[PDB]
Design a protein around this ligand. Structure first.
Ligand SMILES: *Cc1ccc(-n2ccnc2-c2ccccc2)cc1C(F)(F)F
Ligand SMILES: *Cc1ccc(-n2ccnc2-c2ccccc2)cc1C(F)(F)F
Ligand SMILES: [Ca+2]
Ligand SMILES: [Ca+2]
Ligand SMILES: [Ca+2]
Ligand SMILES: [Ca+2]
Ligand SMILES: [Cl-]
Ligand SMILES: [Cl-]
Lengths: 232, 7, 232, 7
């Protein structure tokens, strides 16, 4: 639906949509920009991520509310409505995840040669498979979990070879992979070990950073610390 | 629920 | 699109959507319920109002952000994008207002004989014409403003004859009509006079109320006071 | 901006 709008206009409107807190619009504009077929700059990748994270974040929050109501209903019979509406929200959420994964597969990842872009997109791929895993039950659930793991692992391997331990995308990737281990893979010890090693290796590299980079890195390190405090 | 990355 | 769902299921799902903060869904469910053709109960009217107020509230907030950016752009030329996107949000907002006004006209108002229901729907009609007036510029703007005024005035006339001065819908109607006077009709003195008289007449009637009704009425009286403090 | 009715 964005095929007739200039790439630069789509990016401009994505930024306006962000300011207006219109994240569905923001995501549609950024999808249109990706579909122009050119690689995305660092700023443009961030806009893509912000847009879809906000859209899927609202869906996940709604799904958790409805799932809790449904679980409590199965401990008076109220009919099929709670399950039906949970399924409606779930299908929408899956549709958004499939859309993001489709953009990554056609063709953001294959054109991403620099470490910063490839790690960014593989982290995204892990995240959106993780969101699919959060709602999965059926025959493909193990394969969905393994798809998230595989994407995160490839991103980790690249990030460890190509980026310093304080790089914000490397830190956020490790943070999210640690959440994957704890919440999805039932591996809390792996989650704790990853968060601790990531935090400690970043700490030892802070001395190399400017004041602005130090602020960026320490902000994400605090999220790692917050999880370690919750988990230990 | 732990924190994944957030702005 | 809701024609195949039971009325009771639509109401149940509207309540679930509210809990999940899915206000677009909530509004669609309540539109479906209205279109069943039966009158709405007090609780159902509240669900209809909450759903659309949240939908249009987000649109109004976005429109104000974009309008401010557009105004500042017309004090470097950035192209047509800001105006285009403001117009997109504006058209969506107008569409929602037209939908609500259409439900009121077909046929909620004409079937509403009790004072509580008729005042409720006429207040809604005034509110949604007021939201149209907030974005109006062209040939119909005076007629849009007068449509809001006429709806509010009919609601006021009924409320003064049929309800005590502490009735929450009477208070909220007076509050919103006072906002109309201040922000839309360029009549700040009328706004202040209406808010003051409404507050004082409610104060003198609080002695008749139970503790729960007293809480309901004083909450809205505080909004009247907040505006009087802002305006004087 | 003044307050219109809100929950
Ligand atoms: C997943 C993630 C992690 C960190 C950041 N981030 C925080 C501060 N700066 C940055 C950044 C990373 C990569 C490029 C540019 C900035 C962002 C992200 C995310 F955008 F979500 F991928
Ligand atoms: C416009 C409005 C004003 C007040 C209330 N309200 C507050 C507390 N109780 C009520 C109420 C009014 C009428 C029926 C039932 C409850 C609600 C509303 C609104 F719902 F927006 F119309
Ligand atoms: Ca039922
Ligand atoms: Ca490339
Ligand atoms: Ca431009
Ligand atoms: Ca009737
Ligand atoms: Cl449903
Ligand atoms: Cl647009």
């Amino acid at each position: 639906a964005m095929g007739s709008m200039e790439r630069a206009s789509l990016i401009q409107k994505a930024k306006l949509a962000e300011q207006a807190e219109r994240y569905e619009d923001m995501a549609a504009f950024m999808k249109g920009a990706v579909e122009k077929g050119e690689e995305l700059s660092c700023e443009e990748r961030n806009l893509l991520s912000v847009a879809y994270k906000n859209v899927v974040g609202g869906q996940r929050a709604a799904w958790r509310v409805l799932s809790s109501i449904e679980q409590k209903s199965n401990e008076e019979e109220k009919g099929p409505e709670v399950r039906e509406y949970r399924e409606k929200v779930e299908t929408e959420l899956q549709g958004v995840c499939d859309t993001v994964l489709g953009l990554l597969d056609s063709h953001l990842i294959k054109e991403a040669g620099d470490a910063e872009s490839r790690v960014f997109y593989l982290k995204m791929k892990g995240d959106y498979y993780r969101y699919l895993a959060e709602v999965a039950t059926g025959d493909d659930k193990k394969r969905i979990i393994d798809s998230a793991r595989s994407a995160y692992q490839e991103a980790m391997d690249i990030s460890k070879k190509e980026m310093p331990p304080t790089n914000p995308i490397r830190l956020g990737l490790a943070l999210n992979f640690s959440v994957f281990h704890y919440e999805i893979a039932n591996s809390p010890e792996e989650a704790i070990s990853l968060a601790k090693t990531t935090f400690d290796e970043a700490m030892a590299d802070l001395h190399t950073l400017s004041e602005d980079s130090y602020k960026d890195s320490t902000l994400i390190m605090q999220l790692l610390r917050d999880n370690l405090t919750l988990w230990t | 629920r732990p924190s994944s990355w957030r702005q």
